[PDB]
Curated annotation (Swiss-Prot):
Protein name, UniProt field: Rho GTPase-activating protein 35
Domains (record comment): N-terminal part (1-266) has GTPase activity. Required for proper cellular localization. The pG1 pseudoGTPase domain does not bind GTP.
Residues of the full protein shown: 14 to 252 of 1499
Oligomer and partners: Interacts with RASA1. Interacts with the general transcription factor GTF2I, the interaction sequesters GTF2I in the cytoplasm.
Binding positions (GTP): 15, 20-24, 39, 43, 77-79, 180-182, 208-210
Modifications the protein undergoes after translation, according to the UniProt entry: In brain, phosphorylated by FYN and SRC.
Positions of the UniProt region annotated as Has GTPase activity, required for proper localization: 1-231
Function: Rho GTPase-activating protein (GAP). Binds several acidic phospholipids which inhibits the Rho GAP activity to promote the Rac GAP activity. This binding is inhibited by phosphorylation by PRKCA. Involved in cell differentiation as well as cell adhesion and migration, plays an important role in retinal tissue morphogenesis, neural tube fusion, midline fusion of the cerebral hemispheres and mammary gland branching morphogenesis. Transduces signals from p21-ras to the nucleus, acting via the ras GTPase-activating protein (GAP).
Transmembrane parts of this sequence: none
Domain of life where this protein originates: Eukaryota
Tissues where this protein is expressed: Ubiquitously expressed.
Annotated compartments: Cytoplasm, Cytoskeleton, Cilium basal body; Cytoplasm; Nucleus; Cell membrane
Species per Swiss-Prot/TrEMBL record: Rattus norvegicus (Rat)
Gene that encodes the chain: Arhgap35
Amino acid sequence: YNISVVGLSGTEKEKGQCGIGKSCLCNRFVRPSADEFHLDHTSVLSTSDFGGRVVNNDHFLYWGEVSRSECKMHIVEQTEFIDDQTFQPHRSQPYIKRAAATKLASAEKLMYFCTDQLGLEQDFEQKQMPDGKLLVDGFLLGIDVSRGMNRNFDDQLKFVSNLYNQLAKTKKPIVIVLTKCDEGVERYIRDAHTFALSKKNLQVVETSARSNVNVDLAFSTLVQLIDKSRG
Ligand SMILES: Nc1nc2c(ncn2[C@@H]2O[C@H](COP(=O)(O)OP(=O)(O)OP(=O)(O)O)[C@@H](O)[C@H]2O)c(=O)[nH]1
Ligand SMILES: [Mg+2]
């Protein structure tokens, strides 16, 4: 099962200086131990970092393989990395099209652990993404329902709707995932539920990576929809 985690991404200004929680969700699913869960996963990278084997000149990360409870899940996060001097996106398609990619070729791409790893990967375990290539089986569509540093929520939901349209054209299974529900805003959660109820069989899993609630449920729910359609 190849799972792509997608959501609002871009420049600091487009994220209101607060990402929506993709990285912490992936980190908690793949490595839920306190020692391996990191709350801080910056997307502002030096050219050396971006060209390292973890990022591999891509705007996505390979978070690794999960083999828990027998189903194998391969996890990736689609994001956007900005330059640590110019603060513009690294020149690697627009995010909404990039994130909806279902064929992800990055030869010799290494699994991501933390930003400390970047440009220093000999210092960490070096596990390669399988075959240098992943055919995406399904998408988790993250929606931050936290007030999260005075975010323009309606612009988030507009972005989510356009991203959803691109994903839906693929006919791949999508599960909507509400993030940071430990700080959830009822108006935002309700708006997200109304949006998802406007779509066909769009499931919503309410998660908090920080408090570790319903993360596994989110991924297993997607895996179940994946085999719904595979059958
Ligand atoms: N309260 C709470 N805060 C969270 C949670 N998850 C993430 N955050 C905060 O939100 C910020 C965003 O974290 P990320 O997971 O990197 O967000 P992102 O979607 O990956 O952002 P980009 O990768 O830059 O697109 C983090 O610095 C955390 O402090 C959560 O589950 N609960
Ligand atoms: Mg991220």
